[PDB]
Each structure stands twice: as C-alpha cells, then as structure tokens.
Ligand binder design. Structure first.
Ligand code: HEM
Ligand code: HEM
Lengths: 127, 126
C-alpha cells in the first residue's frame, strides 16, 4: 500500500493521491454513465458487456496511474482498431473522464496530469 | 460549513454569503416556479424530471458560487445543445433568477455579482 511505498521513499503515484482503487472504481462507474448518455458515443458500446468492460477499465486506469493491480484485458490497439473511432470521439470520451474526475473532487491540476497520461493513447485508440 | 472555512482562513465565498446550501435550495425552487410560468420558457421543460434538475441546479449554482462541493451534473454546452436556446431565452431565465434572489432578500449588489458569474455561461447555453 501507500504506507509501504513511503517507507521505501517512493514518490506518491497519481493512483495513490486520488484515493487508490476505491476512487478509481467510483470514477469509472460515473465515466461510463456519462459516455452512454452521450448520443455521439453510446452506439459504439451497443454490443458490449458493460460490467466486464468497466472491470477491465478499472484495471487499466489503475495501472496507468501507478496502482499495483494487473491489467487483465486485451491490448489497446487491437481492441479499438477497426471501430471507426476518430479524434472527435476520443476527445469526447476524454471530456467525460475529466468530468467524472471533477465530479469526484479531484483537483483540476491532477486531472490535467491524468489527461496527460491518457492523451497519447489516442494513437492506439483512433481509427 | 462557513465556521470551519473561516477557521481555515478561507475568504468568504458568494455561496456562504447568501446562506449556503439551504439558501440556494430555496432560491432554485422559486426560480423554477417563475421559469415554468413564463410561456416563452415552459415548453423547453416538457417531460423534464424537475426534481433531478433542481438538485443538479443546486449543485451547479453552489459550485459556481464558490461552495465546497463539486458539481456532478452534465456540462452546460452538452446539456443545452440542440435545443435552439437564444440570448432572448437566456436573458429571461437570468431575469427570473434575479427575481428569485430578490425575493429571497439577497442584497442587489450581490445579485449583481451573481449575474456576473452567470452571464458568461450564455456562450455554452446558447
Ligand atoms: C481514451 C482512452 C481509452 C481507454 C484507456 C480505453 C480502454 C479500453 C479498455 C481497457 C477496454 C477493454 C478491452 C478488453 O476487453 O480487454 C476498452 C474496450 C472498448 N473501448 Fe475503449 N478506451 C478508450 C477510449 C475509447 C473510445 C474513445 C471509444 C469510442 C468512442 C472506445 C470504445 C471501446 C469499446 C466499444 C470497447 C469494448 C469493445 C467490446 O468489447 O464490445 N474506447 N477500451
Ligand atoms: C442561467 C444559465 C443556465 C444554467 C446555469 C443552467 C443549468 C442547467 C443545469 C445544471 C441543468 C441540468 C443538467 C443535468 O441534468 O445534468 C440544465 C438542464 C436544462 N436546462 Fe439549463 N441552465 C441555464 C439556462 C437555461 C435556459 C436559458 C434554458 C432554456 C430557455 C435552459 C433549459 C434547460 C433544459 C430544457 C434542461 C434539460 C432538463 C432535462 O430534461 O433534464 N437552461 N440547465
């Protein structure tokens, strides 16, 4: 945990500073509510088991932000390639993530830092 | 609340200034009384969950006014998109908000301050 990490003089991760696994679960749950309510995005997920997805996204996001949990999903490029996702869509999705983080009380400077980790993924994500 | 905030040496926000969460609840409730009575505005709210809306409006105004809790609703542009809302409509709405704050006893100068925070939102709402 964070306590063990500090005893080792390791710098505090994003994961840790926004409240760890519990914080990410809440964010991700709110994130997909948003994404699915956006008529510009919802159809991409028409064939999706959202429980399973949200489960994989919690793992992905935790690991991306420094958490110790394994990501058990498929690679980003493979999953998204072929889906006709443009930068327009990716940006919309990013906005809902920022919104969810905002809603959970994450400081805006930290949300910017998180967007900094996620933005480069668009390379793998967009058509 | 305000007492804890003052003990932290935080400056008095507009939110705290007007009575905080409980005051905004009352104003919002009255605000929507007036909005729904205006024939030029009513039809926009046909079939709306007014209950949820009011709750989300309390969160929004409170946050916009320097309150302590984040707004958890949808962003202004997205939620108002595709409704054809004009500056005319926004102005009516802002007028109804000023009327509700006046009815709540909020001094005119603070109502002015509040409108200064609200007016710039027209860019997203229209
Ligand atoms: C922006 C960063 C994004 C990340 C980090 C991300 C991450 C993921 C993850 C972890 C999965 C699960 C993969 C698996 O099943 O193993 C997934 C699947 C998926 N992603 Fe994303 N995603 C992103 C953006 C988007 C965008 C912008 C869209 C389209 C607008 C999108 C559409 C989907 C769909 C529809 C699935 C599930 C496909 C299916 O199983 O039906 N993703 N993504
Ligand atoms: C004073 C600036 C305004 C603000 C701050 C504001 C704020 C909000 C908020 C917080 C919501 C709820 C979003 C959510 O469900 O998450 C909302 C929804 C809505 N607003 Fe506004 N609004 C403003 C002006 C207007 C005006 C001018 C109109 C039309 C004349 C309007 C009509 C509506 C409608 C029709 C909805 C959707 C209700 C629903 O079906 O859920 N608003 N607005």
């Amino acid at each position: 945990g964070l306590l063990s990490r500090l005893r080792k003089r390791e710098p505090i991760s994003i994961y840790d500073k926004i409240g760890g696994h519990e914080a990410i679960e809440v964010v991700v749950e709110d994130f997909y509510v948003r994404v699915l309510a956006d008529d510009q995005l919802s159809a991409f997920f028409s064939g999706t088991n959202m429980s399973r997805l949200k489960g994989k996204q919690v793992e992905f996001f935790a690991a991306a932000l420094g958490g110790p949990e394994p990501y058990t999903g498929a690679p980003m490029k493979q999953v998204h390639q072929g889906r006709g996702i443009t930068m327009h869509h990716f940006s919309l999705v990013a906005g809902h993530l920022a919104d969810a983080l905002t809603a959970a009380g994450v400081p805006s400077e930290t949300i910017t830092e998180i967007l900094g980790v996620i933005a480069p993924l668009a390379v793998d994500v967009t058509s």
